[PDB]
Amino acid sequence: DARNDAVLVYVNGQFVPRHQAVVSVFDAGYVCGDGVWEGVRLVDGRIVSFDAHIDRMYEGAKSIALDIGMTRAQTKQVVVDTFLRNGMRDGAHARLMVTRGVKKTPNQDPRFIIGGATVVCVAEHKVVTPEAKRNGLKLFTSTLRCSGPDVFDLRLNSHSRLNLIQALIQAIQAGADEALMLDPNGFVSSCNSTNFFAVRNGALWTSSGRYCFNGITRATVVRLAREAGIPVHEGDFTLAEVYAADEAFVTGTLAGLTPVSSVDGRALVPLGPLTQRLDALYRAYIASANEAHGALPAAA
Amino acid sequence: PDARNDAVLVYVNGQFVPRHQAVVSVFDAGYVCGDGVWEGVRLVDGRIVSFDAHIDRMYEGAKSIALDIGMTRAQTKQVVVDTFLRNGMRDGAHARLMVTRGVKKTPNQDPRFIIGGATVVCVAEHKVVTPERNGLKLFTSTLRCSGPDVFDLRLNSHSRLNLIQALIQAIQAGADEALMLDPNGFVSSCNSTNFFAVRNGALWTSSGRYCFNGITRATVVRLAREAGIPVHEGDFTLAEVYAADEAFVTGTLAGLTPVSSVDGRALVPLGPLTQRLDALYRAYIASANEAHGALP
Amino acid sequence: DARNDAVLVYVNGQFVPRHQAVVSVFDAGYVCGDGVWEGVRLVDGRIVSFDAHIDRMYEGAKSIALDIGMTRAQTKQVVVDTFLRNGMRDGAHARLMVTRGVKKTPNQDPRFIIGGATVVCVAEHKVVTPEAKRNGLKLFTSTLRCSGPDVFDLRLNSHSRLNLIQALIQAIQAGADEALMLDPNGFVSSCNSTNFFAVRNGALWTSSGRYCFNGITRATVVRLAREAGIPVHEGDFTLAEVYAADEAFVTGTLAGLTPVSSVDGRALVPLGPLTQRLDALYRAYIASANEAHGALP
Amino acid sequence: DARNDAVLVYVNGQFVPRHQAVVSVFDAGYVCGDGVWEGVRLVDGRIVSFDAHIDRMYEGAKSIALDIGMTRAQTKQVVVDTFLRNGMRDGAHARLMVTRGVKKTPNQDPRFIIGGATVVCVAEHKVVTPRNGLKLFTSTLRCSGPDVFDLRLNSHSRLNLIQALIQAIQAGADEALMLDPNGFVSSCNSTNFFAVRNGALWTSSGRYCFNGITRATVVRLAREAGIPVHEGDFTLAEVYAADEAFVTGTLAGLTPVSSVDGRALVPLGPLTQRLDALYRAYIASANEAHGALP
Amino acid sequence: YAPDARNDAVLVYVNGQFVPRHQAVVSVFDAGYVCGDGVWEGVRLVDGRIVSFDAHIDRMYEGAKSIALDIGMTRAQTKQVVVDTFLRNGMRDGAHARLMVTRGVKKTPNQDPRFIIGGATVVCVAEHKVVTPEAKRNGLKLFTSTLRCSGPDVFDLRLNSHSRLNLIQALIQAIQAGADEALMLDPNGFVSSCNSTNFFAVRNGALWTSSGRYCFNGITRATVVRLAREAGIPVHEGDFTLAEVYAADEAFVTGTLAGLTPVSSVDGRALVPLGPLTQRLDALYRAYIASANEAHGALP
Amino acid sequence: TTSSQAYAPDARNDAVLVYVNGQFVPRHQAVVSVFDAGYVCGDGVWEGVRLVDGRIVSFDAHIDRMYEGAKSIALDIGMTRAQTKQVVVDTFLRNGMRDGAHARLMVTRGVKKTPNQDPRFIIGGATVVCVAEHKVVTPEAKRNGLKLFTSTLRCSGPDVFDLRLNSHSRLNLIQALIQAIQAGADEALMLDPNGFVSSCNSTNFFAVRNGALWTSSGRYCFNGITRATVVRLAREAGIPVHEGDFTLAEVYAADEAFVTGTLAGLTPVSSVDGRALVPLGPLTQRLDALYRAYIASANEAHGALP
């Protein structure tokens, strides 16, 4: 989308063209991966599941003693302002990135910070029709594991992403699009950047999320499934259960439900019936005037 | 603390940029994802201490994450040299060379869609660490060093929340630095320095299977063996620490820092073996050893 | 409480003045930490949740093949007699301690015990100060872990307590009052001597208890919560979920619900609304003529 | 030995007849298993490897912030005095037990201690005969890693070991063998474990068990006699196919192992016999490791 | 199983042939013999009905899929193998069959699954096997082996395979402790299963069994759980300890071959065999397997 | 489509006689009861040995591993070591092999009264099978090098399954191989439970970094004869050997890697997880030459054919 060349990026309250959207080399985010972020989608004038995203950011920031320096409402207003300044109402997404701040000297220690969080919001136009993603993802189960929370709590949506990127790198070399990752016990946990679901015998299966990002999209699809009386098995399941699944798909804010066409070269039919049903339910939900979605105000 | 640091010029992608303007894109993999490797080096009496050892670690770490540095070792070395030269630094300085995957078309974790090359940044700063080192308080964090199938701590990367989180806990315990156990509960390392204990005239340190394998650590081990001090490199416990004669940490920035307590258990700071190894280390880094790259 | 100086302690069927209440240096409890115990609270003539305590003791004793050498009723009678001998009817607590017995030689081997189990009951006056009048515990999450049951089953309420004391020692040196402990997987398990609870958005959260003492108080508070329609999250939760909690508190027979004012230096407002509601429910429950509480004669 | 009925036990500086040797029910040792101990053997007027034992006690005490309240010399003197008071010169053993002390109220918290550490020393006669050999069963219960409970500590908290022993006894065995968290052979519940394979001694690294003085002695004697010792990770398979096995501890010395999990080994194999003779010679010698009685 | 002279003369299905017992053979190059490379099911024939037949076939198809083993038959055809093996032997009642499907004959003996001449080897051993209540009622002695159930990233014990040394090893240790069967803990130390049967305990009127994350998910196990819930017996399917076993009121094990077998001790800790809830569930199970339920495949 | 298990096709292999329980049986007729413990349960141990210039390479070492493995699973082989040796010798002799051959000796617990796991139910003694085949693995066939993928499936600790056992229960290894095959690789590399490099699914793994040979401790994999030989040859030639915990990072930055086993000797590795390594680097070539010299010598380790 050619219009992406002319977007303004929010950087510490300045609206800046992409080629000039910059942060100090001393920023905690650049030096140390020291920050938390959220991606949100804008559909028909509404930021999808906005509060759920902001809640995860406030929880993640709290866990790393990172002062966001704004109330929830103010942080929301950053995103709102970024969409308004770009004239975006629909078919957009934004990545809100909050890093500890600019450091007196590049090192890990958070006490060496000049106070004031770095706040960046990258808003962009995008789009993809439901059976145009007809291209299922190929998944490869990486040898690199999800961590337990005494090592690194994967509920944290952080700027420290090498633990996930490394699994993706391995999956790419296996000819896959995305890594599936096991938890420390060997049960299926999640993909490197999306949550993983299987369909077995009319039932929806996904991990407990004890060892992966608990995506807002994952949460929404679970809820939609239960509300529709689809049985949901949220708990420990294996690669054997995946290879024998009827369908599989991944979830995340950027693409919604993406069908999976194979796992470790084991074929699954992309876009099976239950994927189709849940996708329709999700598409309806994100387009509705549901109170979970924050209506973008008109400009002043 | 040194007023000259306010005016240093930072290497960014071949340009020397004043401190307050030295910037990287918000789309850079280092900012978005902590996706990069770095090395810190110390400049002593015109010589970059253990320069090659630092560069080899960077090349191996970059290789591990399929990050093309986009430079030969000689070129990379030249970046650091040039950064010191541009700042008129000959002694009492430290530099952090940071290499991140590069500028992405869109901010996300996927390494594939990189416009252009690796981002290369070098921050040099005057950093005199006086021996006048009252000894660190350590607290053993509840947060663990990972095994290499989760996150290989030999990597010196821009993804450091795994270490920072241990440090945060130690800070709230009233300590200066976190000590970290490995997945089996043996002593591994500190959050930003390697850890050593002294027991009965012997030097003890972890195997390094689960922590950064620091250059300083390696140097101190080597000096110890060359001086006929016994070195136990292997699994040891909190109990062995609490009953030690001495303890100290190692890193490029500070050299040997004495430890005055671990989990509130007092140790006499700067014991005899710490003092000897410190003298050996200061001698070594100030010598015309072939391990150190002379500035022009 | 000055009265505590003069209490009589039950020792093997005798009432013994406190300063003379003694056990052989050959006792399995002393040599080896080899025994199980229960703490019970006496409130308004009633031993709180007495049966629940006794059932834990019988299960724990069974797990280490320790024959208590008494029926459940008889064991209860020890505690009853200990309170009655000391003229206690309210405001008291007792520790019933049952160790394997006197050994022919001091070593770990449980065989070759002279006689039966050693039975000791220490009753003492404690005023439990009102809810409003304590400003909350500081917790530090120790580096020392709760064990899995193939290493040491923390459901066991035993005389072998260095595994818990070690975590407490570390927490004390961090400036805290009590240790929080993670399980082998890194999820929150319990404190070193009390069970741990968090409140997150009007909901009560506590571990599954797979890796800690399953306290009677814990079990009571879970049940009270559900009976009151407070949602209860019993399952795996993290330090992150604690640091972002609205409230936290710990449970045990000695103090009831004790509010938590911080965890690893992260402030929590002590005695938040859900702590206060559950405390009122618990204080009501332990003072009621519920059938779970054994009336003194 | 009938003489054991009349021994005097050291309790806090007093020598107390056996049947009156007592500790408060408020003692940290009784309430909580909160203390450290050492077993020592007296051979031909010498306390075997005395300093080594005391050093482990001081290290263990330090790990649990237990103040013994005595210098090393004083602690040694308690044991010396206990043997002297009982007229023991040979064929005796003592257990020195140091618990945190008397509590104001029975609970786990180490802070509320009236006075100093409780110090108890039980000395007893035992003749150690020149012996059927132990049956060992590998318990399902594991040695812990040091972030759960460090088995180098020789403490009064012993149910973690007793539980393994209980399972072994019900399997018809005399002693539990115990694996480490990774499934490698670690130790027995109360003695260190050795296997003999191909002229070589095999024992665990000791990362996950008590580091016994006897174990250390046997390793050294083996190397001085040119028997190699492989201290490392080894498996049940390597035990079941061993030529011999034995256990070590202060109480019995080298005890042969005659089976593990029902798999027969030699009732007393040649290298066990050699090392036992070397050990008996060593503990009877005027070595500087042994503290001569007055 | 009660001694039965008729078993000496049974015909075994081998690759479409009915072969007398003493001649029923497979190539030394077969993947099953060289490598334990195959999946199997045991089924019980009661009053002309193969008990829970589809459930067994479903497990076989999932297990074969997990190891990329093509059974080379439709489910109907697979069923017909079993049917034919019972019919050929004139069995209508009081019989059991083991259906074994191995990857096939190899070009050379090695582990590599690619080197297969021809299709899967299919063997069906049917035998008269009444396990009398006389024989069963007194109960098994269990010993908790030191050898543990694996997590699914090492070996998924839901697989019913020809690679059984991981189970046999536990059993060998139990046999030498004077026990009949090994009980096995999972990697975390919780009770998982026996070496060849699923394990249940009864505590205070409630049925306890493991979650099955670390053991074979037996058909009989699943049937007993369902009968318990249908009878309003509480079921605690979850993590429990040896302490909870040693203090249980009753214990029993389940499997196709013997049904519910009472446990008389675990690690030498006595349990009264055939307690009231074991007897109730046993009565419910015997009723169920003898009924015209649609889960059971009627012989023609 | 590549194995580390491939060798020159050899028409003579159609007609070999297989030892089965004391008989020599034509290949197509060489059979075992469907009640055999090996078929039902994977219940047996095996050894593969290579015949070079009339000498069975490292024969005693193979036999010792078999006897130890059989002991570990209480399997009575029912033959002395000399008898067992003689079975393999006789199998090579009966097929006229003196060179360029490999045998797999398979000993399973025996015929069961009923197919189940219980080892008590055994009629008679152990089943003994020996399959000898002409198997030349040329250096030409090897020069391309194997592609490794690090499987998600891991080597077990010995309290789950002791990988020093060379058993008929091989789905634990085959599963890792299946995953590697679908990644486009020839063989699976496997990590140990701690995440350190352990072994391949059917061969031992080595890396070369800076003139030094690196291989795992072997605490968590088959302790191959070939592996042990290569370690000793390296030490004897003064090449430093790092036997201990190393990582995927250490592999991806290696100068060379190769795998070892009886069937192929030293096979160079060309990539691990898509990370290229030059196949047949200088230290692989030196160790290969040392190994070929060693297996062709009259070393005391090799069993002379009569």
Ligand SMILES: Cc1ncc(COP(=O)(O)O)c(C=O)c1O
């Ligand atoms: C699993 C495994 N790895 C590697 C090898 C290679 O070892 P060797 O050199 O002894 O054939 C073997 C031998 O069978 C093996 O079984």
